[model samples]
Target: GPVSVANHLGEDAGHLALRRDVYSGLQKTPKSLPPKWFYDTVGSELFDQITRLPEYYPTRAEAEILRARSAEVASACRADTLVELGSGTSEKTRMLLDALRHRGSLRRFVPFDVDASVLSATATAIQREYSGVEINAVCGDFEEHLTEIPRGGRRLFVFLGSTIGNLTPGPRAQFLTALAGVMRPGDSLLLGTDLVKDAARLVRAYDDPGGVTAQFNRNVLAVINRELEADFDVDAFQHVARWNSAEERIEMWLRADGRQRVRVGALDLTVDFDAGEEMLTEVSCKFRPQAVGAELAAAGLHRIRWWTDEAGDFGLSLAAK
Candidate 1:
């Protein structure tokens, strides 16, 4: 069985306050949400399914780009140790690892994520599948554990699945700076970013026709109820997805069907919602190539190459310190 750290860095009150502030800010707008809430156990599972959906082009497009360009990307990194930030199931990561191993460039693999259960399971599966590869699993947030990673050697840091979009601009920049600080001078980063696309298409991906995304959004409330002894009627919220042109992101929310009250025991908190109020849930920010490159450059990284699918719906950027 896997055990979670009782006091992971991001689980503290300060971090929760930051998250709540982001959520609160988004709620004041037109049905918007922060993406962090979409990572409770059920939310994670729904996201995995969402990646496989036909309408959700980011995952498939990024996978195609990786498949076509991973060999060259791996060659450029010339990595003996490969590390992935926020590596969930590592479902698409095996391709890049195989590419590097085939070139005799990789000997170790490290996957880091906040969820201990998923991290342990992924580590065991990878160890079994790739018998010779060294697998190091870190069960903590990437922001806190970046520098703690084994630093020596030719390392390739992977930040894939466009998960980076979840972070706001300031945090994203800070995260990149942290990554740069952790890397040796010649280390490389393989980052996946969702490209700016039609607002309708972007919104459609988050609000899938199957209603799974809706269920996923509401599950966050269920998690709060279970973990903090809060009382919330999950079904009283409706799923919403909208594009914010100014921020270049698609926001998801659980809009309240009517007024409701919920109490959390630990916080000694009672929250009230007016009719048609909403709980902010998630955001997926889209980026342009130049914008992303500029952001990387600001963090002491130089973009070496950018790859995209046929439709140009997503981007895979390889940058180095």
Candidate 2:
């Protein structure tokens, strides 16, 4: 069957949203930007490279757990539809898809993501790889468009890549509560999360020696420069990654090397950065087993099974509504 795609973003996901984000995020006391803006073509390519880096263990560890435990999930849930949030490239999804097909229950696949280009390409590739399975690719943000996801069957919602950790507690709770609202009683959720580890190890993961991660971090400024006509010295910022023990998160910051003034032509605004001042770019929160279970419970989902890689660096939890 051919792949089908539907857009839920409309025009808001376009240029205006970036302007809004810039206006709101850059004007704050502690300037910050949403991580979603880091997915320009260059940034996306850099991230793909980061996954293969030696220091970046989350991708490999999650893949390891999925490789070993996908069969268990297939047998336990037998989901007919696999809905993957932020389903970029759909690279690690083959394991779950293959397991579900082996169980003879796979029917539909929903690759949901904000990037329509990537989503369409992924849908076409998956349709070619898996015969007889229907592909319904959705161009939408999980935070705003989960309810737009089509419903039916023993659906399995897959949120991999520890993306949930990208959200702070407030947004995380809202996302989970909203997800619980849309999911049926029989539906299941497969979540990939990075586990709390040694602080140094966590820091090293975000601040790789090869500097690919740094390039990826600074790419956000380039995105703003291109899209919003902002004059930002993307190279003048130094990337810093630090582990917050209290929050159990890795914080990525871009520190200005010297005082600089920038202008956003689109917004008719000028902004200044003092020397050594840093702007928060990303916060990746790591989780504990009990916290994962309790979070699901709060959202009306039951944690039935949990699996981890051999090194215990990452976790995959299967929960049912």
Candidate 3:
């Protein structure tokens, strides 16, 4: 049987979302941009590429923690079904899945993300590889369509990939609260976070020497060029990754190489950039065990345990409702 899959995003949604985000975020005091827009096909593919680069340590470290602790993690959060947010293809989740299917209570798996094509691919793979383990794939933003997730069984909710840092403190609170909204007693959340470490290593992680991160950052503009019918000389901007100590995040920006004008056709907008002007593209926050406790409590969750890589640069926390 084919796996169950659902999509909640609409055609006008992406365009409307891009225009609204760019307009509002750009008008902020610091002139920010939403990192969500950085996932239009090519940008996302570039991201997948960046993840494989040598300097990008988050993916590797995070995977190391999960790979080693999957059995213990599955045993602690034992559930009949697993619901994963931002489960892009779920390539790394197999470790946990193997433990669950073999020794723990995993009869079904539900994957949710922004891409339906990827969902379909993942569904096929799940069906083919993990036979008898039912697959239900949902295509919707985690915050927008969480209610659509099934609750007929004991569920383990996973929001991996350190995406929690993508939000500012205010929005982070809201997101945690929203995630808590869908849980029942005995349900748990397994969250992945990039922990605080040496500022130098952090800098290198976001700003790689090979320039893959640069291309990944600028690819967002190329996304706008195609999606919003904009004219952006993507190459005219150089990528910059700076440590934002106050926020405990490495921020990525695209700095204009020289004075330039760009037009976004769908929005009827033209913007001028001075030689040094930098637009905030993304902020990858680093957190610590102590720093996340209050956030968990605020979201009506209690941390069961925290697992970190040998280097302590990445952590996985299992929290219960």
Q: Which stretches of candidate 2 lie over 4 Å from their true place?
A: none
lDDT agreement with native, every candidate: 0.78, 0.89, 0.84
The C-alpha local distance difference test score for the whole of candidate 2 amounts to 0.89
> Cα miss at 294, model 1 (Å)?
0.3
Q: Check candidate 2 and list the clashing pairs.
A: none
lDDT of 3 by residue, 1-321 (tens): 359987898956767888898766655656578888777777777788888988888899889988888888888887777788875465667877787887847788898887788888888988888877889999888669988887788788888889998888888999889888889888889999999888898889888888878888888888788877888899999899999998889899899899878877888877888888898999888898977877888899999989899988898899998
- Model 1, global lDDT: 0.78
lDDT of 2 by residue, 1-321 (tens): 668999887766668789888998889979999888888889888999999999999999998888888999999987998998876365678998899999998999998988788888898888898999889988887668888888778899999999999998889988989888889988999998899999999999999998999999999999999888999998899999988889889999999999979899899999889998999999999999999999999999999999889988899999999
User: Candidate 1 at 132: error in angstroms?
Assistant: 2.4
Which residues of candidate 1, in runs, are more than 4 Å off?
Answer: 1-34
Candidate scoring better on lDDT of 2 and 3: 2
lDDT of 1 by residue, 240-263 (tens): 887999989988777888998877
Q: Write the number of the candidate with greater TM-score, choosing between 1 and 2.
A: 2
Rank order by TM-score, top first? 2, 3, 1
In model 3, the clashing pairs are none
State in Å the error of residue 158, model 3: 1.0
* RMSD in Å for all candidates: 3.7, 1.1, 1.5
Model 3: lowest-lDDT 10 consecutive positions? 23-32
